[PDB]
Amino acid sequence: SLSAAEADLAGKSWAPVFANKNANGLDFLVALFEKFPDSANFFADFKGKSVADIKASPKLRDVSSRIFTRLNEFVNNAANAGKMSAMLSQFAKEHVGFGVGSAQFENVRSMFPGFVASVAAPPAGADAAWTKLFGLIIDALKAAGA
Numbered sequence: 001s002l003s004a005a006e007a008d009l010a011g012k013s014w015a016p017v018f019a020n021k022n023a024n025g026l027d028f029l030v031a032l033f034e035k036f037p038d039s040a041n042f043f044a045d046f047k048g049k050s051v052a053d054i055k056a057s058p059k060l061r062d063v064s065s066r067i068f069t070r071l072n073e074f075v076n077n078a079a080n081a082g083k084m085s086a087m088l089s090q091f092a093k094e095h096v097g098f099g100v101g102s103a104q105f106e107n108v109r110s111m112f113p114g115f116v117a118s119v120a121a122p123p124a125g126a127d128a129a130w131t132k133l134f135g136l137i138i139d140a141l142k143a144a145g146a
């Protein structure tokens with residue numbers, strides 16, 4: 001887990017992002033797709049589609065919302081190694097079954113701090129907390145067989 005201090009920093013940087021969950025969450029998805037085009041092929045709904053197609057799909061909102069809803073719960077529980085264990089196991093089990101692996105989560109980690117900053121400048125120490133939070137997911141995915 002993160003320490004209470006780091007988790008506080010991550011929550012602080014996430015606040016302004018989550019404040020506009022519909023829009024920011026669709027934006028996160030599109031950024032992902034722009035930067036790491038192969039990601040899209042993991043989704044049944046967007047396999048083969050171009051970013052333009054993705055942005056115009058009526059399915060986008062459901063996908064971004066579920067990521068944001070779940071990410072929010074990770075942020076909230078990040079300092080409780082207890083809940084983190086449970087959350088990460090499930091999260092990884094779910095993903096691996098869909099063919100998604102840690103490399104795709106390395107990609108998310110790479111671009112996340114840049115994405116948060118696109119909304120509001122994060123406090124000192126926040127980027128590192130996010131990178132350690134995503135490092136934990138990456139590790140759970142490796143544990144799950146990918």
Ligand code: HEM
Binds near residue numbers: 045066
């Ligand atoms: C960044 C944070 C992410 C979070 C919080 C997240 C969250 C979720 C959750 C909540 C579900 C629905 C699980 C269920 O109820 O069965 C799931 C589905 C899925 N996610 Fe993620 N996800 C993340 C990133 C990824 C990435 C990077 C990929 C693809 C590269 C991925 C691909 C999938 C697929 C393919 C499934 C379900 C089937 C599908 O829609 O095709 N997710 N994810």
Ligand SMILES: [C-]#N
Binds near residue numbers: 063066067
């Ligand atoms: C995948 N959300």
